[PDB]
Design a binder for these strands. Sequence first.
DNA 1: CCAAAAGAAGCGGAGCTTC
Length: 1095
Amino acid sequence: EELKEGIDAVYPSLVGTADSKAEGIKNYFKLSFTLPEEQKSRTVGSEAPLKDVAQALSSRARYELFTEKETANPAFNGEVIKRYKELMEHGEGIADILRSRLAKFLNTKDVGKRFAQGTEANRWVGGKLLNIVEQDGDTFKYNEQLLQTAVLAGLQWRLTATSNTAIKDAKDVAAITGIDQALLPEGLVEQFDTGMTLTEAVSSLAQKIESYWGLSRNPNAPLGYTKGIPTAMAAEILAAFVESTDVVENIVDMSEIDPDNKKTIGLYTITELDSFDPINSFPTAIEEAVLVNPTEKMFFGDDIPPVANTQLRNPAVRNTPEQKAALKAEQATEFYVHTPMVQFYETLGKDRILELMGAGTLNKELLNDNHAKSLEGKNRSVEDSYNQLFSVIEQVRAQSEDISTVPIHYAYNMTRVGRMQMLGKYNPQSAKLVREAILPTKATLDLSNQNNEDFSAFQLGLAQALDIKVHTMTREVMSDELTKLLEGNLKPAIDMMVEFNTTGSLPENAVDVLNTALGDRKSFVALMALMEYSRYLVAEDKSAFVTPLYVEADGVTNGPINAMMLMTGGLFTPDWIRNIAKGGLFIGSPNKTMNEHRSTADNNDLYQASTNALMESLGKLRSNYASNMPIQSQIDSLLSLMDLFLPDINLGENGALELKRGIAKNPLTITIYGSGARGIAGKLVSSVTDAIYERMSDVLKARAKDPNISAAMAMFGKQAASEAHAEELLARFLKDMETLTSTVPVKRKGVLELQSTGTGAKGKINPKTYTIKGEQLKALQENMLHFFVEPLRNGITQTVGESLVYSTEQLQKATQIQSVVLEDMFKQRVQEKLAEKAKDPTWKKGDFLTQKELNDIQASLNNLAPMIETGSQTFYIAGSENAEVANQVLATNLDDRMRVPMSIYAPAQAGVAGIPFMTIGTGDGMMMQTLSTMKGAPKNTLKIFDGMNIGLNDITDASRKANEAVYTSWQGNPIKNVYESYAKFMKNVDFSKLSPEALEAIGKSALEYDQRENATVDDIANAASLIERNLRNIALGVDIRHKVLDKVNLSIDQMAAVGAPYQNNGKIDLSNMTPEQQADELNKLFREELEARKQ
DNA sequence: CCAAAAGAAGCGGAGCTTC
Ligand SMILES: O=P([O-])(O)O
């Protein structure tokens, strides 16, 4: 334990004594950290890190010598060295600002003088930096090594933080602002997606600083300092970047939006460098020079990423051996630049790509204000995508004269729900633009004869890319549809691309040609198809055509189908057999493919079936109120309004109601993820208003093209057949909007009743500022909920099966109950330890617990089975990082601002997360994992969770293995896994130890709404034990269903497109049988097996 | 609705209070 002497020898002049017992000023930096047994950072021991790294970066020779490496990244050339020299000079500026802020802090309120006299200011939430200062005459100054190293981390963070940020969805934004996701104003999510909250910025910053300091945390040091000191430094650096304008701080006032919320939220945006800044070609020089084992870097050639030991943001969960194997397999895949697309992108240019794939140049006065904000969000995603791609290309180009020959590797990690996610924000897996320029797919085809198997594969790839639903028709039929398109509407674009793959030039109207030829088929992969077809046309040796064009073996209604196969636990029913066939599970039809099923057996997929069940359910609701004209009218107005702006809603001339599968796609999807009815109503309403806000921009653009244009023939001109026909459409719109915002349906004892809101909506509409706000959005929502979503949910349940719904409810209840106990017990164990610490003179409130004390508290929860094991995957549903456990500030900057709450890794309630976790995890998660590690695992693919991109040369075998992988995941039993964990929990849990708050939460999950109020600890305990039994029975059934189904002859083509189904070779033949007959035989096998168990 | 959480700032030196 000579560590004390060691760290003191490195920082012998820091203020205070490294002894938590000493009476005077104690130095918590020396108490909190220790030198690593093996060097982690090259700045440790350095007296002037900035000067030393600046010199290291001054020349390639000096760099190589500093990083003790014979060679250096070729991208580190002259122009780049020059940018870094300038950035280093800027680091001196940030350091100078930091030194002055400290000086100010020391002067104000005589803090420094008081600190010198013994006031323990180095323990205050805003004075932890005083732990890295040194006495200087009558004042104090930063230890230059710690300060400059932190500024270097600040520089690296400034360069690449933005590209490592997570994407914020509605849910996220709602959490931050506290505003109901359904009411989130327009563009709010965009403003918050392009920025970083305080927690977000400081957190990532503190991580970098601590890593660059290169020390290790002392397990017996208070988190208040081990985590607080690096965080305090980060807060000061963020403040310094605000002063230097490297970062813009924007305090968003929620009261301006929702006048009831008083939250004011800080948003931090890093100032972007010019897209053409040389530093973009090599933004990680500092990182790679400072750290022994750099984190941020590209992996070229044979430089492969290491394999992550723990699940993403879940340190407590280790990646299983099979998961690690999968990660290794995916990281070994070599990706390569497709020069043709890169050249095409570069020639079209950023502006035209935005015009073609974004919103082009939008002038804020020809567009609705809300619509505008949406278009701006669209442009951003594509633009950042474009710039990221070319910064990558700039670095690849330096690795060789032929960029198409430089192998690129990507790091991956397993997420909380078992998905193999490629690290980074804009990469082949996450960004469509990048996916068509950097591919792992490659094949050499013989396209000299259009009758070759190779040409057919090529056709399949082209058709799928061009939006031909290749999995719904046979290969032969798709071949004809593709030909028709290539020879017809696409011909003009094809000709242009031919010219491009000859002279390298594009017409001035390239965007119009493409846009016209593609229509709604437009996408980045569609551009790849046009490019690849045109390259083939001009190809010299069509006998050996090399192309990365791919075919995606794509899951058909994957999530829902997986849930149905994994969690249906009763006897087999004919409706289930017919419905599961829609997902590629064919019983008694050897070698049957999805292509044949859709063309000769059933043309309706699971979405269509849901939509059709919705129509039935909707019809029933109308009958129950057949006599109530007010209701009938409210329903007609809702349907009228949707048919007015949504493609999937058609109202026939004679009133015939038609709904297209599209309307059910997301609702079904998220309903399988545990979503509630209100959330679905909210999304449907948003898709309506978005169409409306856009139609307002269609109007503004109508008046500019002709001032004397009737509102009717300006808003519905293109959607009408005349001016009178447009007048009646406008009548509908105005009618519906007023009725749907002034009147809303209410649930009063099972019956629906209309009530005025008093907040009706009407008046001269201004196509410029038109907006449906709060109370009116709420009304549209209430109408959507009861007249459309309610029946939709009934339709969904009827389609996926009530048995599956029952299973998901028990799963949700079990995992929720368990998470409540984990959360509560953990907080109490913490509370007891703190009350125990308050009796310790060395300890101070604000200091928290040590990592060892936290590790102990977590270990003590093991008997409650916090982890769910499957044998190949581990799930920690309750796991999280929240501020509710410590409930205090960790640190602030020296201006008493940027107060970062102390977050701790600890269990928190699960809510409904148990459903997504287990369904995604044992479903598509396990399948991809299996696909990456199974015998003969397909090579050179790009896996995207529920679909996989395959090179045209291996489409048949890779897709058959994919279907085999699906079959393998269908042998899983997530309920059984939950059961095993829950049963251990039930035999060690003590409900009497739970706070009244926790015990009530449990009552909600385990008890009927009519038994909470007076529920005794012994009551809810017996109710919880009932769920264990429910789970055990569900799991037993699932286990039998899987065994029995495996005895029958099955053709599996869930990962459809190619027509290569996996055959399980079941011995029992169920061919020439109706679904009713098959269900009878399967149930016979079931009842038979049931006895085997009983005996 | 899962994928990662999540207010700011005076006064005083924590944590209550006001917007
Ligand atoms: O083109 P897909 O969606 O049928 O695979």
